[PDB]
């Protein structure tokens, strides 16, 4: 129940505002900046502000914070969802999120803001569907918005029917300073770029553990996803009945399904790091990285971020394989490796200077983060079984899919 959706800037200037209910005066935006400054300066800064009886709940974008004032007991989750939808629409329409487009795309921005939400209740949020009614360079609205299928425009025709899938893996590992892993969660991500003719009804099929158990084949390699979240095109009833994933893919790249389950396997990379930091004299970085992943897989662009001392200067690196660079902006040792064969072992010996004068305040212990991205590797063992592309006209589809394994929340706690 947002009262007015407004967009501010880094200097507190409201780039664009769009009142929805009008129950809040437009002059309350002035106190938002001082309130945010006070909250941040006292540790009480939160995305949901409160100017007396009016609450300013908003998130920070790339260049401006989309703060939306509200007065009643509106759904904060609904406001956040509307803000996320607006951000996604802006990203789809504008390739960049900065002040250069707010002052240059106001003609289309105002129309999009007016059409998206009326009286604080949004009605349309599909960028592809909205692109047929609001353009910056107007006919009747398409029947897709009025029809049930609001994510697949009818009448789309293409020379070929090629759909590219992306089985993106996110390896998140939370290794404590004692050497044990606390949080090891792997979240699957099946992103497909559907480009076909008509309105095909995709019928995705995989070797799911639940599906295998229901069919009676619960003995082969099946992915046991704790959480499986289908997209808007995925029918909830079909998945709830017999694990049937039947939905109409949209025109373009979109997120269809996102598996999420815990992982009980050993880490694909084992990092043995040592810190021989002398008292204001010198420091040693005996970092050894062992690849526990399969030897047939190569981790392209391995980036093991090693947090070095903040005041360290005049450093020397004694490594084995991979480029090691210290970035003063980041204040860490970037263990950059181009290609890492599975089972490889990289040993490094850090040596950097330290000032005699001690630091005035503590800086903490940032965790060591690895940025390994090994494609063509499926740690979870989930493999796509079938993809039923059915069209009324009748055509031979050529679906495609790729499996990419990368490091997600793969942070290692320091000692």
């Amino acid at each position: 129940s947002a009262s007015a959706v407004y967009v501010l800037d880094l200097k507190g200037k409201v780039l664009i505002c769009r009142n929805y209910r009008g129950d809040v005066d437009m002059s309350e935006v002035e106190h938002f900046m001082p309130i945010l400054m006070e909250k941040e300066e006292e540790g009480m800064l939160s995305p949901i502000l409160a100017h007396g009886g009016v609450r300013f709940m908003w998130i920070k974008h790339n260049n401006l914070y989309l703060v939306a004032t509200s007065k009643k007991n509106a759904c904060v989750s609904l406001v956040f969802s509307f803000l996320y939808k607006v951000v996604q629409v802006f990203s789809e329409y504008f390739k960049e999120l900065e002040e250069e487009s707010i002052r240059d795309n106001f003609v289309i921005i105002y129309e999009l803001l007016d059409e998206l939400m009326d009286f604080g209740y949004p009605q349309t949020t599909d960028s592809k569907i909205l692109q047929e009614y609001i353009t910056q360079e107007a006919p009747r609205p398409p029947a897709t918005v009025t029809n049930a299928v609001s994510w697949r425009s009818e009448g789309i025709k293409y020379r070929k029917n090629e759909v590219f899938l992306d089985v993106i893996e996110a390896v998140n590992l939370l290794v404590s300073a004692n050497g044990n892993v606390l949080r090891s969660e792997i979240v699957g991500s099946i992103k497909m770029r559907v480009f076909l003719s008509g309105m095909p009804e995709l019928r995705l099929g995989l070797n799911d553990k639940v599906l295998f158990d229901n069919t009676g084949r619960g003995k082969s390699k099946s992915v046991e996803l704790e959480d499986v979240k289908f997209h808007q095109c995925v029918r909830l009833s079909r998945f709830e009945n017999d694990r049937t994933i039947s939905f109409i893919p949209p025109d373009g790249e979109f997120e269809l399904m996102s598996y999420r389950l815990n992982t009980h396997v050993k880490p694909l990379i084992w990092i043995e790091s040592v810190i021989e930091k002398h008292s204001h004299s010198r420091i040693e970085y005996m970092v050894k990285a062992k690849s526990q992943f399969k030897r047939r897989s190569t981790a392209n662009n391995v980036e093991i971020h090693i947090p070095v001392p903040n005041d360290a200067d005049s450093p020397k690196f004694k490594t084995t394989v991979g480029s090691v660079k210290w970035v003063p902006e980041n204040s860490e040792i970037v263990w950059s490796v181009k290609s890492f064969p599975g089972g490889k072992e990289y040993l490094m010996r850090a040596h950097f200077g330290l000032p005699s004068v001690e630091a005035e305040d503590k800086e903490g212990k940032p965790p060591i983060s690895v940025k390994f991205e090994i494609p063509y590797f499926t740690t979870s063992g989930i493999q796509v079984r079938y993809l039923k592309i059915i069209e009324k006209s009748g055509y031979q589809a050529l679906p495609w899919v790729r499996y990419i394994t990368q490091n997600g929340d793969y942070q290692l706690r320091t000692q």
Partner: peptide
């Protein structure tokens, strides 16, 4: 080719499950 694993064609359905 493509970084992150070469694209592979997918099946149509579980042929072994009828």
């Amino acid at each position: 080719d493509r970084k992150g694993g070469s694209y592979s064609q997918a099946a149509g359905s579980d042929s072994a499950q009828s």
